[PDB]
Structure 1
Amino acid sequence: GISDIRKDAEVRMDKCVEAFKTQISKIRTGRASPSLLDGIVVEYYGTPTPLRQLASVTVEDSRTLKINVFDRSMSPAVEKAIMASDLGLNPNSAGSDIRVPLPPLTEERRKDLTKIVRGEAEQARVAVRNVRRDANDKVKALLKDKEISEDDDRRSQDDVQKLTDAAIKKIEAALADKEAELM
């Protein structure tokens, strides 16, 4: 029934945005941001375990992170992960703490990145929209099997529009947030 489908859409769509927002935080920024340094995987006694769980991540400044590895033995294995996450990152060890300089920001890059970002945004709007599409599909179909007044039908498809525009504007807030960084 309509009222059921609006739920399922709000949701699917929020999923869409949130998943955007995430891919975003995994991108070499202008600044620091432990968000990316998290995802990284470390070899932790055979069982892989995200670096997040073996060591603390500080912002030692704008353009340099400081990874306090709780367990000192793994220190060498942790570092290797930063270079093995292939993220253009060079982890300089120096006394119980792994310094990960954040690069300066070149021209080649800013481009490089924004184009990547803008296109991840558009892949995103595309997901949102696909949900527009099943949504209307469901309803559209509850028209025959006259289970809905032609009125009902217009109306709802409109909520779906409302939902879609909303999910999107979110997506574009996000994109803009980041675009600020890169520029």
Structure 2
Amino acid sequence: MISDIRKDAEVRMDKCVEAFKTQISKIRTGRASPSLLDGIVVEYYGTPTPLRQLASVTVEDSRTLKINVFDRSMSPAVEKAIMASDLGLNPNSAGSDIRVPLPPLTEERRKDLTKIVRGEAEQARVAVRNVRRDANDKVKALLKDKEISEDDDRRSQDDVQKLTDAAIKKIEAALADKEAELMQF
């Protein structure tokens, strides 16, 4: 019946938007990660050792790392090791903690990612319009032989169109926030 069909359509459209929302949250928009500097070699009592074994690296923010050295006497050496890796990283030392601001993703990268979210959004929009269509079908078709008539078709078609509108609207909002994120730093 028509009671089923439309509630069936929005459950379908919801799944689409939600798949898009999860597919997109995977995309990182900044360089920040707790293991980003794990590979930096530090002079530790003669022996070169990866930074990972000498300090805790926490993500203070999307483009900044906070390095927590376990042995305070090693901080100076860690700071030199960071400058020395020649990654363009300007370590900012201050009070038992070293902070590491990070360069933004490259122009080329942002474009590769903008392109990916747009394609996924696009996919989400086609999926949503296919569900709309499948609904319209049942409705318009049921009009042929079984019980529904023009004014129930109209309303039903319009109620469905609006479901499509709200579903398309969520995808657009998820997309915009993501590009705003990408374009952020």
Into which bin does the TM-score normalised by the smaller protein fall? 0.5 to 0.7
Offset from partner CA, 1:7-31 (integer Å, 9 cap, x none): 1111100100000001101112137
CA 1:44–1:18: 2 relative to 1, 3 Å: farther
CA 1:151–1:30: 2 relative to 1, 3 Å: same
CA 1:109–1:138: 2 relative to 1, 3 Å: same
CA 1:60–1:151: 2 relative to 1, 3 Å: same
More displaced stretch, 44-53 vs 124-133:
44-53
CA 1:147–1:117: 2 relative to 1, 3 Å: same
Contact 2:35 2:57 in 1 (8 A): no
Match of 2:83, SS state, is helix
CA 1:72–1:175: 2 relative to 1, 3 Å: farther
Counterpart Cα distance in 2 of 1:87 and 1:59? 18
Percent identity, aligned pairs only?
100
More displaced stretch, 139-148 vs 36-45:
36-45
Higher-Rg member (1/2): 2
CA 1:103–1:139: 2 relative to 1, 3 Å: farther
Match of 1:120 in 2: 120
The gaps in structure 2 that reach 5 residues or longer are none
CA 1:8–1:98: 2 relative to 1, 3 Å: farther
Offset from partner CA, 1:112-158 (integer Å, 9 cap, x none): 11111111101110111110011011111110123101111111011
Q: What's the TM-score, normalizing by structure 1? A: 0.64
The gaps in structure 1 that reach 5 residues or longer are none
Q: What's the TM-score, normalizing by structure 2? A: 0.63
Match of 2:96, SS state, is coil
